[PDB]
Design a protein around this ligand. Structure first.
Ligand SMILES: Cn1cnc2ncnc(N3CC[C@@]4(CCN(c5ccc(C(F)(F)F)c(Cl)c5)C4)C3)c21
Ligand SMILES: Cn1cnc2ncnc(N3CC[C@@]4(CCN(c5ccc(C(F)(F)F)c(Cl)c5)C4)C3)c21
Ligand SMILES: [Mg+2]
Ligand SMILES: [Mg+2]
Ligand SMILES: [Mg+2]
Ligand SMILES: [Mg+2]
Lengths: 196, 197
C-alpha cells in the first residue's frame, strides 16, 4: 500500500537544475518510473527558497501587498511574484526573507510568521520554500525612501497593490500589461475574497 | 531600462513528460545572458498546461469545507496535500478539465464559480502554467452524498475535507501528525483566509 522511492538515476545536470528518472513502488506492488526535476543548490537547508508576503502598513492608507515584476527566462515573459529567492548556506528562513525583501524592494520588515517547508510543484519537482509573512512599517524613516540592492542579473520592478482589492487589481494587470501572475500570489488573492 | 526577450531556446535533454532547455535572453542593459529552463512536453494549444481546483463543499448546517487530496509524489519522495489538479486534455476547456479532475480524484460533481487566467507554478524554474478554477460542491445533492472516485492508471488519491474557517491550523495539525508536505498554493490560500479575518 505504501509508496516509496527505490532509486534515482541522473539524466542531466546543469549548474542550477537537474533532471532525474525516479523509480518508485506504487500501492499495488508495481514499480513505476517518473521524470523528476531538482535544483542543484539545496544543502543542509529545510527548503530551497523563501517567498515573502510583505504587508505594507501606512496609517490613513489601505494595507498593500508588495510584489515584484521580473522577466522570467523560463516563462519568456514578465511575471508578478512575491519577493523570493534561495536560502543561503547556514542562513535561517526568517533571515533570508528579510534580506530578499530588502534586496528586491528596499523595505526593512519584521517577521510575522514562517510556514513549514511547502512544495512548489510536487508533480514536477522537489522544490520547496518557506512562505514568510512580513509586515513593513511604512511610517518608519527606514522605509520612507526604500533602497533596493539587486545582485548581478536581478532586474526588479516594485509593485504595491491594495490587500482589500488584490484579486481585481491583479486581473487588471493581466489584461492591461499581458503579465503572468504567480500561482501562490493568485491563491492568496482568491482566498482574501473567499473569506467569510 | 530596455525590455527583455528570448533570443534562442536550445534543447539539452527531452523526456516523455519534461525537458530541460538552455535559454539565451537579452537583459535590460543590452547584454545577453543564459538560463537553464524546465518545460513540460505535453503542452499544445491549451491556454495552460493544467488546472488546479479550489472545491468548496457547501452543506446546510455545516461549515464550508475545502476539498484537498493526498498523493504520493515521486519528485518529492513522499505524500503531499494538494488542490485537485491535472493536465488539460487537447481541445478540453479549463473549466471542463477542472470538473473532470475533481470528479475523477474525489468523486464530487462540482459547479463552476470562477476561472483564473493562466498563472505560473514556478516561473524561476519552469514555464508551467495553470488555471485556478474555483468550484462549489452542493453536498446536499444526492450525487454528492457518497462520492465515487474513478482514478486513471497510476493515480492513487486520498480525499481530505478541512473546514474553511480553520484551514491553516488543520493543515498544521496534519504536518505535525505525520510526514507530509503541504502544497505552496494550498498554504497561501490558508494564510490569506487567516489574514482576512
Ligand atoms: C505518468 N508519468 C510517468 N512518468 C512520468 N514522469 C513525469 N511526469 C508524469 N506525469 C504524468 C502527468 C503528470 C501527472 C500529474 N500531473 C500534473 C499534476 C498537477 C499539475 C498542476 F496543475 F498542479 F500544475 C499539472 Cl500541470 C500536472 C501531470 C506528470 C509521469
Ligand atoms: C543565475 N542563473 C543563470 N543561469 C541560470 N539558470 C537557471 N537558474 C538560474 N538561477 C539563479 C538562481 C535562481 C534565481 C531565482 N531563483 C529562485 C527564485 C524563486 C524561488 C522560489 F522561492 F520562489 F521558489 C527560488 Cl527557490 C529560487 C534562483 C535561478 C540561473
Ligand atoms: Mg488603513
Ligand atoms: Mg537573490
Ligand atoms: Mg533576489
Ligand atoms: Mg489526475
Amino acid at each position: 500500500g505504501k509508496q516509496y522511492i527505490i532509486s534515482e538515476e541522473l539524466i542531466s545536470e546543469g549548474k542550477w537544475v537537474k533532471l532525474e528518472k525516479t523509480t518508485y513502488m506504487d500501492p499495488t506492488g508495481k514499480t513505476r518510473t517518473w521524470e523528476s526535476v531538482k535544483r542543484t543548490t539545496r544543502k543542509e537547508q529545510t527548503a530551497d527558497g523563501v517567498a515573502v508576503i510583505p504587508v505594507l502598513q501606512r496609517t490613513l492608507h489601505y494595507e498593500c501587498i508588495v510584489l515584484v515584476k521580473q522577466f522570467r527566462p523560463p516563462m519568456g515573459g514578465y511575471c508578478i511574484e512575491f519577493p523570493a529567492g534561495l536560502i543561503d548556506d547556514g542562513e535561517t528562513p526568517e533571515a533570508a526573507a528579510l534580506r530578499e525583501l530588502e534586496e528586491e524592494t528596499g523595505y526593512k520588515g519584521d517577521i510575522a510568521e514562517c510556514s513549514p517547508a511547502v512544495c512548489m510543484d510536487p508533480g514536477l519537482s522537489n522544490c520547496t520554500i518557506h512562505i514568510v509573512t512580513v509586515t513593513i512599517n511604512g511610517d518608519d524613516a527606514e522605509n520612507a525612501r526604500p533602497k533596493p540592492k539587486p545582485g548581478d542579473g536581478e532586474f526588479v520592478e516594485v509593485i504595491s497593490l491594495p490587500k482589500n482589492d488584490l484579486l481585481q487589481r491583479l486581473d487588471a494587470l493581466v489584461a492591461e500589461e499581458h503579465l503572468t501572475v504567480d500561482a501562490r500570489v493568485y491563491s492568496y488573492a482568491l482566498a482574501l475574497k473567499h473569506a467569510n
